[PDB]
Amino acid sequence: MSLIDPRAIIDPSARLAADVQVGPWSIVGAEVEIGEGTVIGPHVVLKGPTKIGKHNRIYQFSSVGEDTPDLKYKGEPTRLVIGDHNVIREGVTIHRGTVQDRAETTIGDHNLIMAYAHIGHDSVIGNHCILVNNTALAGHVHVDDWAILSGYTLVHQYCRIGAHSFSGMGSAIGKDVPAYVTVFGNPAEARSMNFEGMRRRGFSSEAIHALRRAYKVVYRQGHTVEEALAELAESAAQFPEVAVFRDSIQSATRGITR
Amino acid sequence: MSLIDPRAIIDPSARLAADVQVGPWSIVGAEVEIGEGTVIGPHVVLKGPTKIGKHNRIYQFSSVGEDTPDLKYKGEPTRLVIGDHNVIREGVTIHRGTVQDRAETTIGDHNLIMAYAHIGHDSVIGNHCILVNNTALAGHVHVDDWAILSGYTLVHQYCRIGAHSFSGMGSAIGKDVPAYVTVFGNPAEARSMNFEGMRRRGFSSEAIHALRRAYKVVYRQGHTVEEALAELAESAAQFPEVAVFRDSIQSATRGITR
Amino acid sequence: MSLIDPRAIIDPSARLAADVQVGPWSIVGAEVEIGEGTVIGPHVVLKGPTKIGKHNRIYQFSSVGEDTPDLKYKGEPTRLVIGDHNVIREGVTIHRGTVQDRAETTIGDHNLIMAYAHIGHDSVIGNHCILVNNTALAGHVHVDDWAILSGYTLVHQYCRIGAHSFSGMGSAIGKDVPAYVTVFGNPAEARSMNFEGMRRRGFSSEAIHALRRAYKVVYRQGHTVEEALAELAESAAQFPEVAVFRDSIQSATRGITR
Ligand SMILES: N#Cc1ccc(CN(Cc2nnc(N)o2)C(=O)CSc2ccccc2Cl)cc1
Ligand SMILES: N#Cc1ccc(CN(Cc2nnc(N)o2)C(=O)CSc2ccccc2Cl)cc1
Ligand SMILES: N#Cc1ccc(CN(Cc2nnc(N)o2)C(=O)CSc2ccccc2Cl)cc1
């Protein structure tokens, strides 16, 4: 009983580790590297230059490491890097980067990418993200740790989904989602904060509330961004959690001279 | 060529009726049971424990019987039950139950589940339902007979879709959708009642109108749900058709004392 | 590398040009015609009667020429036509026509149909159209040249998407989209005009401006469509670019006598 199946295809150009298993009718293309204990299901298409890590699980009908259909991509040998302990569910589409950004699509550790979800070119996902069904990242989308993207959440190109943030099902995100913020609908509008996630991450009640006031300052208090950021400065100095929230709003805003 | 294509792999644990046709590069997993005249297309992945009824047609790229990715589910042996005369089109993802509900996903008889649709854990489906393209049922979703869910309809967990009720395309469903009621958009708002469904099911000239008056009480009259069920009480007792509508509202509401 | 892979199933009635590539585990059904230098990836189902033209690229997990699940279609011998120099990405579903319309679904040359998109019965696609991830054309939909349909755009049956027009991501199109208009939302509403589309297609600044003034008449001025098309007449006879726009509006509105 062999790890790699007789009906599967493995390129001698590819590099598979020890307990790497490849299900039947699965293509392991050239320049693909699969780390220790990773399991590849049946009818799975893997294309390189790709670097899949240790103990990931890639389900049937997923197309991982494919050239973007983007008219931007001219054929360049761009990469994709996948961490350890990721779950890439059925029919998930992961495309490699474009020379235009930094030639790389990057997925971290312990992420759960559910059915038909799209991780488009030059996107960067951290650790412990949950990407529910058909969640689509257009390209160059940066998804920080613990972000939850509810079913069919769509993200416009270049956006930044903050740490601990949450997007409601069928969300259309066109601007950066600050850390801990819960956005909902098409077009995504901020509703509140991921207090449940804060609890899960063992956040002190003092820090949870600091984050509740931190939201009210940015949104509810009628302040502008440039003002909210300035107000936040005190609470942000007192709470490393409020400081994550402020830095996410500071990195989203640049602006022009008047 | 014999019904079970030689390019297909069947678990010696599986039990298939003698006239069951299985296409090439398909997988019939352990504990999968398939009733008389059921046709399984090419590239279909069936995982057990699953009971598939009679005269069903399963199209290519479907992953029927697969474990839910939900962290709630820990690999507990739970079931999938599919009725008779169903159409599960291309790439339909049907997942098995979780021990938290009653460990079973249930699909009735004579239903049409279209391309890339999703029936998540414990979702219970009645009969003659049309579940249009990419429709997603998050988990523990109940769908009563005749119901029509337009393309890319998203239903939340624990939700109840009533009998003959229609949901417009792109619909994002949060609360219950009572029987006959047409709901549209993200978030789904009630608009009218499925009068074509009533016409198709030969509803008496009197019932159709009794149901139109019934929606008004609930919606258009500015009553509470408590007062709506009170006004409906008379008509529900006059017609078993309105009673089907009164019960969908009755079961959907409980609330707290005050 | 060989041209047609040993594990592919090529029906004896399918007619392929001498240099067609059919990947492993791909099915080329009866009455499927394949043009000079077309490429069919691994895991692709092609059903006839379908005519695929020259230098096309059909990708994995695609179902091209499958009968529509629609209840109006009763196993008729209806057709599907695909042009030349087209790209049909992973998981795309294209269905044949119904005898009801012209018994034919057609896709012209130079299109980009992105991952998991759907082309329903009797749909007619022009040339140089981009159809981003999971676009869904319910049926009888007409997409004209250079139309850009963003991620997860949903298009109701019998609709017309005009030349150079654009729908934003997660748009639910119910009424016709005139040529050049940028429509957004569920339900989709007209926002402006695809000016970037106009520059790319080398439009004269004199005619870009004429088209700006054109949208203004219809949408931004309080004119009834009757009055809109009347005011447009002058500009349309001066600018062929504006003429297209007048016609796209002309062809949508028929109306009933009053
Ligand atoms: N592990 C987990 C986990 C946690 C939070 C979410 C966010 N969430 C709520 C939810 N919680 N458990 C479940 N199954 O869903 C949704 O996205 C609902 S929409 C949806 C959901 C599932 C499938 C298709 C659709 Cl369309 C989703 C999954
Ligand atoms: N048999 C049937 C039947 C009945 C009602 C519906 C509900 N419906 C309208 C409609 N009626 N006939 C058709 N083809 O569509 C939609 O869902 C449109 S959206 C859509 C539709 C199809 C595919 C992808 C998408 Cl996105 C759909 C099918
Ligand atoms: N060739 C091209 C081309 C041109 C315009 C568009 C329109 N467009 C903006 C954009 N431009 N390049 C990219 N990748 O996106 C979107 O539709 C964003 S949404 C999205 C995007 C990609 C995948 C899934 C989703 Cl959901 C898209 C592609």
HSE at residue C230, side-chain half, CA atoms within 13 A, is 5
Tokens of C219: 């949408």
Q: Which tokens belong to B32?
A: 């999968």
Give the ligand whose atoms come closest to the C-alpha of residue B155.
1
Nearest chain A residue to B187 by CA distance is A185
Q: Residue A152: list chain B partners with CB under 8 A.
A: 136, 152, 154
* C111 close to C82: Cβ distance less than 8 angstroms: no
Which two tokens mark B2? 């014999």
- Taking CB atoms and an 8 Å cutoff, what residues of chain A touch B93? 90-91, 115-116
How many C-beta atoms surround the C-beta of residue A77 within 10 A?
11
b (16+ CB within 10 A) / e for A7-23: bbbbbeebbbeeebbbb
Nearest to C38 by CA among C60, C59, C53: C53
For ligand 1, the distance from its centroid to the CA atom of residue B69, given in whole angstroms, is 9
The C-alpha atoms of residue A49 and residue C228 are separated, in whole angstroms, by 55
Residue located nearest, by CA, to atom 6 of ligand 2: B150
C130 lines ligand 3 (CB under 6 A): yes
d(CA A127, CA A143): 9
Q: Tell me the β-bridge partners of B34.
A: B16, B52
Q: At what angle do helices C205-218 and C240-250 cross, to 10 degrees?
A: 20
Q: If we measure between CA atoms, which residue out of B226, B211, B110, B227 comes closest to residue B165?
A: B211
Method: X-ray
- A136 and C114: CB-CB below 8 Å? no
Please list every residue in chain A whose beta carbon sits closer than 8 Å to the beta carbon of residue B152: 152
Q: Quick check: B169 and C138 CB within 8 A? A: yes
Is residue A60 within 6 Å of ligand 3 at its C-beta? no
| Ligand in closest contact with the CA of B122 | 1
- Whole-number Å distance, alpha carbon C114 to ligand 3 midpoint, is 9
Residue A143, CA distances (Å) to A119, B12, B53, B103, B110 in order:
10, 44, 43, 34, 42
Q: B169 and C172 in contact by Cβ < 8 A?
A: yes
Q: Ligand 2 test: best mutation among C157, C159, C186, most atoms within 8 Å of CB?
A: C157
Distances (CA, A) of B73 to B76, B136, B154, B202: 7, 19, 21, 43
Give A136 to chain C, closest Cα distance, Å: 8
Question: Which residue's CA is the nearest one to ligand 3's atom 14?
Answer: A138
Burial label, B50 (beta-carbon count in 10 A; 0-12, 13-18, 19+): buried
C122 belongs to the catalytic site: yes
Pull the structure tokens for residue A42. 């049946």
List the single residue in C45, C93, C138 with the smallest CB-CB distance to B42. Answer: C45
Residue from C25, B34, A59 nearest B22 by CA: B34
**CB under 6 Å to ligand 1: residues?**
A 130, 132-133, 148, 150-152, 169; B 70-71, 118, 120, 136, 138-139, 154, 156-157
Min Cα distance A185 → chain B (Å) is: 7
- Which of B45, B170, B186 is closest, CB to CB, to A60? B45
CA distances A167 to A153, A243, B101, Å, are 7, 21, 26
How far CA B235 is from CA of A40, A149, B195, B229, B250, in Å, comes to: 58, 44, 18, 10, 14
Chains within contact range of chain B (3+ C-beta pairs < 8 Å):
A, C
Pocket perturbation via mutation, ligand 3, pick of A67, A68, A70 by most ligand atoms within 8 A of CB: A70
Cα–Cα distances in Å, from A244 out to A143, A196, A201, A206, A233?
14, 17, 14, 15, 11
User: Is A144 noted as a catalytic residue in this protein?
Assistant: no
Q: How far apart are CA B68 and CA A118, in angstroms?
A: 19
Experimental structure resolution, Å: 2.9
Give the integer Cα–Cα distance in Å for C66 and B27: 22
Nearest to A95 by CA among A110, A83, A107: A107
Report how far Cα C166 is from the mean position of its chain's Cα atoms: 12
| Minimal-distance CA residue of chain C relative to B24 | C25
- What residues does C118 pair with on adjacent strands? C93, C136
Nearest Cα neighbor of C70 from A233, A192, B130, A210 is B130
Say which ligand is closest to the CA of A135.
3
Q: Cα dihedral angle (A99, A105, A106, A112), rounded to 10 degrees? A: 170
Q: For chain C, what is the HEC assignment? A: CCCECCCCEECCCCEECCCCEECCCCEECCCEEECCCCEECCCCEECCCEEECCCCEECCCCEEEECCCCCCCCCCCCEEEECCCCEECCCCEEECCCCCCCCEEEECCCCEECCCCEECCCCEECCCCEECCCCEECCCCEECCCCEECCCCEECCCCEECCCCEECCCCEECCCECCCEEEECCCCEEEEECHHHHHHCCCCHHHHHHHHHHHHHHCCCCCCHHHHHHHHHHHHHHCHHHHHHHHHHHCCCCCCCC
Give the Å distance between the CA of A138 and the centre of ligand 3: 6
Which residues is B136 bridged to in the sheet? B118, B154
Q: Are B172 and A170 in contact (CB under 8 A)?
A: yes
The residue assigned the tokens 């969908």 is: B248
Alpha helices in chain A (DSSP H): 195-200, 205-218, 225-238, 240-252
d(CA B201, CA B155): 25
Q: Which residues of B touch C (CB under 8 A)?
A: 7, 24-25, 42-43, 59-61, 87, 89-91, 112, 114-116, 133-134, 151-152, 169-170, 185-186
Nearest protein Cα to ligand 1, atom 6 = A150
The angle at the Cα of C54, spanning C52 to C56, to the nearest 5 degrees, equals: 75
Per-domain boundaries in chain C: 1-192, 193-258
Question: With an 8 Å Cβ cutoff, are C112 and A61 in contact?
Answer: no
* CA distance to C177, C226, C240, C255, per residue, from C217 (Å): 16, 11, 17, 20
CB A257 within 8 A of CB A226: no
